[PDB]
Ligand binder design. Structure first.
Ligand code: ZN
Ligand code: ZN
Lengths: 55, 10
């Protein structure tokens, strides 16, 4: 289930507004559980630091 | 990024 995806760091995945799913690699994360909280959840065009480390 | 939500009923 896609909803099953929860912030890997927390696991509550209840913050609908802050839970961002990384398509590159990371599964689910919160804007605050990542790096300095982002202004908002990107419109589907973003990646987490784990995928960036690849490059 | 895609938004995801999670809630439980009880
Ligand atoms: Zn979190
Ligand atoms: Zn990633």
């Amino acid at each position: 289930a896609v909803d099953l995806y929860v912030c890997l760091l927390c696991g509550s995945g209840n913050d609908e507004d802050r839970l961002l799913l990384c398509d590159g690699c990371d599964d689910s994360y919160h804007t605050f559980c990542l790096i300095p909280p982002l202004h908002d959840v990107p419109k589907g065009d973003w990646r987490c630091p784990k995928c960036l480390a690849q490059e | 990024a895609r938004t995801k939500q999670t809630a439980r009923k009880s």
